[PDB]
């Protein structure tokens, strides 16, 4: 559990531009690429915005439908991907609502109960061999779906 | 131990900076970035705030490890054109390095002058992102031994 002190938008913008200007294709030779437990990545991301959500009077639900799911990736870029989805979810979330975060065997879903920064999500995902699906949820609200090939 | 890194707002707070450094250093090199001309969020940076803020990130943790951090400000209203996150990384690397090779009970000196700042420890007499970020900002970095013993890093610029 390493600590890094800062906001997110400014860190995101810089990293996005550095990724674009490097014209990087694969993760193979990136510093610190490892097998990331997505369970811990998602939980760690929830912990980071927990207090922010509390003061915005928003709850964060973490549903773990699968366990032991591991993907090859750069933990910092992946954390940045998740953090942008959570920040977006919290931002457009009315008091008393729940931001829904679900870990499935081949995807994770970030869902809010509301009515760019999402372009880096797509860029980091593609880099990680992940697809990103945006759209409206069944029970209403905005829904981001990051998916990969099931192991 | 864990590959994961907490993003907010002794070894654990050096590790965070270490991981961000490694990634951004690599990305800087691969992008072969020449100037600040097209970088996002390039602005006039007040160096007092940057140094004080960096000291603030470190102070309490270093205190618990019996290391005192002294910030001296000889000049004020000093502004440089730069990218804030990169300058924050530069300063923090020099700081983490100075706290790391500092023996217990010693003092780390951070000094801001008109055309330079100095980070100085009392330790013995890897981090070349400092050189890279500095060069990008039109700054020079000089390493060496302190006038009274210990390590010294000086970041200088013109005007």
Swiss-Prot record, chain B:
Keyword Nucleotide-binding: yes
Domain called Histidine kinase: residue spans: 1-157
Description of what induces expression: By the signal autoinducer AI-2, through MqsR.
Alphabetical UniProt keywords: ATP-binding, Cell inner membrane, Cell membrane, Kinase, Membrane, Nucleotide-binding, Phosphoprotein, Transferase, Transmembrane, Transmembrane helix, Two-component regulatory system
Compartment list: Cell inner membrane
BP-aspect Gene Ontology terms: phosphorelay signal transduction system; regulation of cell motility
GO function terms (MF aspect): ATP binding; phosphorelay sensor kinase activity; small molecule binding
CC annotations in GO: plasma membrane
Function: Member of a two-component regulatory system QseB/QseC. Activates the flagella regulon by activating transcription of FlhDC. May activate QseB by phosphorylation.
Protein's name according to its UniProt entry: Sensor protein QseC
């Amino acid at each position: 559990a390493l600590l890094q002190l800062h906001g997110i938008d400014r860190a995101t913008r810089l990293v996005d531009q550095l990724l674009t200007l490097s014209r990087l294709d694969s993760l193979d030779n990136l510093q610190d690429v490892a097998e990331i437990p997505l369970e811990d990545l998602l939980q760690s991301s929830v912990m980071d915005i927990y207090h922010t959500a509390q003061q915005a009077k928003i709850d964060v639900r973490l549903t773990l439908n699968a366990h032991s799911i591991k993907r090859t990736g750069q933990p910092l870029l992946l954390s940045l991907l998740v953090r942008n989805l959570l920040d977006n979810a919290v931002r457009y979330s009315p008091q008393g609502s729940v931001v829904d975060v679900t870990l499935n065997a081949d995807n994770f879903i970030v869902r809010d109960n509301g009515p760019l920064g999402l372009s880096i999500v797509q860029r980091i995902a593609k880099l990680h061999g992940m697809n990103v699906e945006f759209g409206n949820a069944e029970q209403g609200g905005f829904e981001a779906k990051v998916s990969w090939l099931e192991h």
